Amino acid sequence: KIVNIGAVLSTRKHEQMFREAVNQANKRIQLNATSVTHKPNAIQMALSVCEDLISSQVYAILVSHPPTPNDHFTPTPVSYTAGFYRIPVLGLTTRMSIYSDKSIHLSFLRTVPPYSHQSSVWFEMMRVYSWNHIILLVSDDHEGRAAQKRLETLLEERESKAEKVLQFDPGTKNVTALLMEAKELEARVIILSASEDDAATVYRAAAMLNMTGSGYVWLVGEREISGNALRYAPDGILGLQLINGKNESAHISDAVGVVAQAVHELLEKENITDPPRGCVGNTNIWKTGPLFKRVLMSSKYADGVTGRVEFNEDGDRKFANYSIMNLQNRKLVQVGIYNGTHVIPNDRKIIWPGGETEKPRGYQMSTRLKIVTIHQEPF
Amino acid sequence: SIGIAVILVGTSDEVAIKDAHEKDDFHHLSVVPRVELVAMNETDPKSIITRICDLMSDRKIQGVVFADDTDQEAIAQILDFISAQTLTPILGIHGGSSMIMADKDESSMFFQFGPSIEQQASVMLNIMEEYDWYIFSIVTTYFPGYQDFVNKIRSTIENSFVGWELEEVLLLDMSLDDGDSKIQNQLKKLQSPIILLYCTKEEATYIFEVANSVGLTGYGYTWIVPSLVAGDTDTVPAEFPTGLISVSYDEWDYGLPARVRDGIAIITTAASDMLSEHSFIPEPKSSCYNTHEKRIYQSNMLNRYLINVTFEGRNLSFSEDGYQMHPKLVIILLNKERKWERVGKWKDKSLQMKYYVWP
Amino acid sequence: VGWELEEVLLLDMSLDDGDSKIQNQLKKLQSPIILLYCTKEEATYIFEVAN
Amino acid sequence: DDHLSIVTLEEAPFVIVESVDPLSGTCMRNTVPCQKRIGYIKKCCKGFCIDILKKISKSVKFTYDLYLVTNGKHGKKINGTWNGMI
Amino acid sequence: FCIDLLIKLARTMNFTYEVHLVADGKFGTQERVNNSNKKEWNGMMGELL
């Protein structure tokens, strides 16, 4: 038999080494690679996916990062079209929490955690440094709402909550009006859940609002310490960065292996049907697709180029590790190590905002109190 | 004029659909509704992309009304992605496009003729408030809407006059293998007379077979379930308790031409006002090739006119996520046999049911 | 002494396929102590139902 | 967790300890039991505070097991260590 | 009584205070909103919260 594992893989130069992974995948009932480059258009991909399925009848489809830097709508058509037949889709480079739900992407897998899994790092990192009151500066988009959701439900384990959560609007300009409300607030720890563009807008405002000085702690993700945001990001930012999230070559080698390992497990099953021969002439649900997806989550890789590969309940990555940046002298340095369960700080010192070598308390209690009384005669 | 695409998939009375096109009196509004209809079986998603792209390249339609006879959820997602790139509204009045997705793209103008999960959650509080039922128990699985379902319920109890109290909020996980014991233990703590359940159609069978092992199916115990679990009312897994109550869209009294007429009305009324005030006919580039370069124009002027639409005294308004603010909902209760019979309806916070006192 | 009795629940074993009926009226048991008077073999059926 | 130990001490209108009924050998209606260490000797407690304890535990929904203190009385700081009900 | 007690609290626990009388003029109770099935506080209780 022939099993097709073709992918909608941009950067055609990566397809040169993608086939080599398939070549050894058979030796590690045949696996065929029908990778197609991902063209700039989006509507064509919905039409091109059927064409690839017409001539290949792929079992698992994979999608990588296109030359365009949006990385929000480019991988959806592969998920949307393959979800018609419940064909699993592999998120090589997608890091958006929209793909983390099973309502929209019923059959979807990923090899990189979304931006919303940085929340689980923050709780571990803020527990190590003994921070109990935090300010959230989340955005209003779906990516933000998932990041804010995870932190709030994670703090319920300690039976507490963020002191106050702030949501702005994506693509805003005059954000100082909302952020001033957080100045009088007792908590000093600020957590940023903004995009690459939205991080800078808060950063420039915070510079003029004296919030980047001494006594303030900034916790951000990958987006806020990358691109144009880093140009105006104040020093001392303690951010996050995945080790090999953008390494398409690293993530294409292990991704085929998980499907390759599942192929051996796919041989022994019941009621196995080949994927639809033609997209135009087929409209059935292909119940083997859910079966292939269901066993895919339960299958855990023993090794890999980027470590062990195991999937979550929603199909996202699990037990991944992040690298902790630190903006010193307009440059990022590694300060922390993530074990997937704990945070191991590096030997390098931590330069907090304002140059404070000593770790700030992160909470300034206000000794000025507003007191309400009512006119009662003797009292 | 107005470019309207009415698409019917499956077995439907196409003749009655064309009748409402001329019968819709838009003389005062002067919408000039041009309705072009193409009928084809489900076949492929590529057919929908081929049909939409070619038709939008032919007459430059400014709106689409979609009706389907298949219950698959994949249809709804495709047209949502279509609207994002085609920059044209799509209306899933009935079928697989009618069922509501939890999240809708910001750049997409796909709207649905159905109620959100939170919208159904408030209805359960409405129906059981009448009969002095105040003690609940939320039973939820790992389905994506579980958090929204339980947050809306909890957010209505917090500062309500009525003596509403929630006993257990247990959340299950049957993803793990051999989860019979773990599920049985959690379901064993239920004591409340009323239990609110949120799962899939198949997961309800899994829950109900182990709830009967505990015995949570007596006449004194009532279960309130949304439309997602019931799905089609015809199929009963022989494990649903005799007395289950569910809410759903008023599909019995809403026909395909009736939804089509509402589909025509909502698009036509919105497009008339913008031409009166903004005076800009949405005519995006007809070719889908290199759509990114064609994003110079915009089509959000008509987007907020579809949000607020009134027709024949009906507040046919839409939210940002596509669901109806005041949809036609019907309440169904299991009878002596395994059949679903309507008991009442909820509309504009004026819920009324044909059964009083309750047995 | 502050004695109080809650229920004197009497169960039926001779019924055929009445297991669902037996599990119904045993739920109302809420006392910390339930005095069971039955055969050794029937107690295996009763206890597994109570479990 | 719902079962916790509760100290008590005899004060005239608030906690009135009584010997057990010689006939039945166990405590009375409306007079909850309370141990006493002199080996333990069971006794029956009733009073203003016990009635509050019954009404509290019916609403807070917890169980208890009273026992009269013996280290001392309500509480005193002797050599930096408390003694009695405290 | 209460101000003289407040000054003692301010001195002993070392905080500064600004007093303002209740705008509402009420002590505090939970009432009915204008037809929304919700309960809101008023007076000092609704100012503290």
From Swiss-Prot, chain C:
Similarity remark: Belongs to the glutamate-gated ion channel (TC 1.A.10.1) family. NR2B/GRIN2B subfamily.
Domain of life of the source: Eukaryota
Assembly behavior: Heterotetramer. Forms heterotetrameric channels composed of two GluN1/zeta subunits (GRIN1), and two identical GluN2/epsilon subunits (GRIN2A, GRIN2B, GRIN2C or GRIN2D) or GluN3 subunits (GRIN3A or GRIN3B) (in vitro). Can also form heterotetrameric channels that contain at least two GluN1 subunits and at least two different GluN2 subunits (or a combination of one GluN2 and one GluN3 subunits) (in vitro). In vivo, the subunit composition may depend on the expression levels of the different subunits. Found in a complex with GRIN1 and GRIN3B. Found in a complex with GRIN1, GRIN3A and PPP2CB.
Tissue specificity of this protein: Primarily found in the fronto-parieto-temporal cortex and hippocampus pyramidal cells, lower expression in the basal ganglia.
Disease with which this protein is associated in UniProt: Intellectual developmental disorder, autosomal dominant 6, with or without seizures: A disorder characterized by significantly below average general intellectual functioning associated with impairments in adaptive behavior and manifested during the developmental period. MRD6 additional features may include seizures, hypotonia, abnormal movements, such as dystonia, and autistic features. Developmental and epileptic encephalopathy 27: A form of epileptic encephalopathy, a heterogeneous group of severe early-onset epilepsies characterized by refractory seizures, neurodevelopmental impairment, and poor prognosis. Development is normal prior to seizure onset, after which cognitive and motor delays become apparent.
Species: Homo sapiens (Human)
Protein's UniProt name: Glutamate receptor ionotropic, NMDA 2B
Parent-record interval covered: 195 to 245 of 1484
UniProt modification remark: Phosphorylated on tyrosine residues.
Gene: GRIN2B
From Swiss-Prot, chain D:
Disulfide bridge partners, by residue number: C27-C44, C34-C45
Outcome (variant: C34R): In MRD6; decreased protein abundance; decreased localization to the cell membrane
Glycosylation sites: N79
Modification after translation: Phosphorylated on tyrosine residues.
Tissues and organs where the protein is expressed, per its UniProt entry: Primarily found in the fronto-parieto-temporal cortex and hippocampus pyramidal cells, lower expression in the basal ganglia.
UniProt similarity note: Belongs to the glutamate-gated ion channel (TC 1.A.10.1) family. NR2B/GRIN2B subfamily.
Name of the protein this chain belongs to: Glutamate receptor ionotropic, NMDA 2B
Section of the entire sequence shown: 403 to 498 of 1484
UniProtKB/Swiss-Prot annotation, chain E:
Glycan-bearing residues: N14, N34
PTM comment, free text: NMDA is probably regulated by C-terminal phosphorylation of an isoform of GRIN1 by PKC. Its phosphorylated state is influenced by the formation of the NMDAR-PPP2CB complex and the NMDAR channel activity.
Compartmental location: Cell membrane; Postsynaptic cell membrane; Postsynaptic density membrane; Synaptic cell membrane
Free-text comment on this protein's domains from its UniProt entry: A hydrophobic region that gives rise to the prediction of a transmembrane span does not cross the membrane, but is part of a discontinuously helical region that dips into the membrane and is probably part of the pore and of the selectivity filter. The extracellular N-terminal domain (NTD) is a site of allosteric regulation to modulate overall receptor function.
Subunit structure: Heterotetramer; the NMDAR subunits are modular and harbor tiered domains that function in concert to regulate opening and closing of the cation-selective ion channel pore. Forms heterotetrameric channels composed of two GluN1/zeta subunits (GRIN1), and two identical GluN2/epsilon subunits (GRIN2A, GRIN2B, GRIN2C or GRIN2D) or GluN3 subunits (GRIN3A or GRIN3B) (in vitro). Can also form heterotetrameric channels that contain at least two GluN1 subunits and at least two different GluN2 subunits (or a combination of one GluN2 and one GluN3 subunits) (in vitro).
Family statement drawn from the similarity comment of this UniProt entry: Belongs to the glutamate-gated ion channel (TC 1.A.10.1) family. NR1/GRIN1 subfamily.
UniProt name for this protein: Glutamate receptor ionotropic, NMDA 1
Species, as recorded: Homo sapiens (Human)
Gene field: GRIN1
Part of the full-length chain shown: 458 to 506 of 938
